[PDB]
Design a binder for this molecule. Structure first.
Ligand SMILES: O=c1ccn([C@@H]2O[C@H](COP(=O)(O)OP(=O)(O)O[C@H]3O[C@H](CO)[C@@H](O)[C@H](O)[C@H]3F)[C@@H](O)[C@H]2O)c(=O)[nH]1
Length: 370
């Protein structure tokens, strides 16, 4: 019996999609998969034993604490052979690092008033419980930067870390698309042959720099701008970003969508992925774009930004972030189709020659070992 703990399941998050693929891999090896969550949106594999954990606190942090306590009591009466968490909490045998190091985030960005909160104390305590010395929890990591951060704040025993290769779903790959996918999916989405489709995918618009993408769109020269659209796709509220698009006179150019299940089609249809995130532990969409043959503009803060430079299929905007640099890079990329075509080819080549896929098998090995 392998128990999985994540606070919330829904289809439009990387943490959730990585969990689904890892847990499905574990189940397919013959183990019984039990899932504890506060809430579950979308389909659930019939193999899974799904347990909804009742909570009543009025804050995320309070509910998380209640969840941990309830799960511990349930495990006391119904033992599992291994407990695997996708969120930081006590009691895990294995943790998957979908998040950044919270202690480092706070140290770098926050001050005294931020640290006064019960919210801070909780998240710090649950991270500490996972990473501190003396714990047995195996730590499945996405980036070397994550490891450096956790070592800095917790002096975690180095042997407990294991970096995983990426785990991009094969259905995003250019070679897994129907013939004429670009034309078909452009037509499906109302994109004209001559238009530029910019694509931004992710369920945290603010964190992922949707504002930066809108600013970049707005900065384009008049004629180019008139031929350019931006699709913003994810389970988040568009309100603030609609207001910004109106402010900048590009409201009609920007199309907002809730969570979509057709991201593979959108990447086949698009001309550039924009992902100028403020914070991103890794960024699965960056590598999805690589596998789709979709060139990428992103920021150096993203854990997976280096892959864009490695694949030579876009531009990584350096820190400190310059909006003017992103604006110029966008204008250049859009006006230089030969550059974009070369980037796309480079992306496809990298996707064909690099392991961007095996994460769930390697994570399942760690989970089921022994
Ligand atoms: O409307 C939508 C919106 C998204 N998706 C999919 O959800 C995934 C999003 O993962 P991504 O790593 O890009 O961002 P995020 O969800 O913030 O992931 C966290 O967890 C990730 C690790 O699990 C980590 O990479 C990241 O840094 C964390 F913030 C990616 O596979 C998208 O194609 C979708 O299908 N439809």
């Amino acid at each position: 019996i392998v128990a999985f703990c994540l606070y919330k399941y829904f289809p439009f998050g990387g943490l959730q999609r990585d969990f689904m693929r890892i847990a499905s891999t574990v189940a397919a090896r013959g183990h019984h998969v039990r899932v504890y969550t506060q809430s579950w949106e979308g389909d659930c594999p019939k193999a899974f034993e799904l347990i909804q954990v009742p909570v009543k606190s009025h804050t995320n942090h309070g509910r998380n604490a209640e969840y941990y306590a309830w799960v511990q009591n349930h495990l006391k009466e119904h033992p599992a052979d291994r407990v695997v968490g996708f969120n930081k909490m006590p009691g895990l045998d294995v943790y998957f690092a979908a998040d950044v190091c919270y202690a480092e985030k706070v140290a770098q960005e926050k001050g005294f008033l931020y640290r006064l909160t019960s919210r801070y104390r909780h998240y710090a305590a649950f991270e500490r419980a996972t990473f501190e010395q003396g714990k047995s929890t195996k730590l499945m990591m996405l980036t070397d930067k994550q490891i450096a951060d956790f070592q800095k704040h917790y002096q975690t025993e180095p042997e407990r870390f294991q970096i995983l290769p990426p785990g991009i779903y094969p259905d995003r790959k250019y070679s897994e698309q129907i013939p004429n996918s670009r034309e078909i999916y452009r037509q499906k989405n109302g994109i004209k042959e001559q238009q530029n489709l910019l694509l931004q995918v992710g369920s945290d618009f603010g964190r992922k720099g949707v504002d930066r993408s809108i600013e970049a769109l707005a900065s384009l020269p008049e004629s180019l701008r008139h031929n350019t659209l931006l699709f913003v796709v994810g389970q988040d509220k568009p309100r603030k970003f609609e207001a910004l698009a109106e402010k900048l006179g590009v409201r009609s150019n920007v199309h907002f969508f809730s969570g979509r299940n057709d991201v593979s089609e959108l990447m086949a249809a698009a001309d550039l992925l924009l992902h100028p995130a403020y914070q991103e532990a890794a960024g699965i969409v960056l590598l999805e774009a690589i596998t789709a043959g979709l060139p990428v503009l992103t920021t150096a803060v993203c854990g997976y930004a280096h892959y864009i430079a490695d694949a030579n299929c876009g531009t990584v905007i350096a820190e400190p972030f310059s909006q003017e640099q992103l604006n110029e890079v966008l204008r250049k990329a859009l006006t230089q189709s030969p550059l974009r075509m070369a980037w796309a080819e480079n992306a496809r080549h990298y996707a064909d020659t690099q392991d961007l896929y095996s994460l769930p098998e390697k994570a399942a090995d760690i989970i089921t070992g022994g």
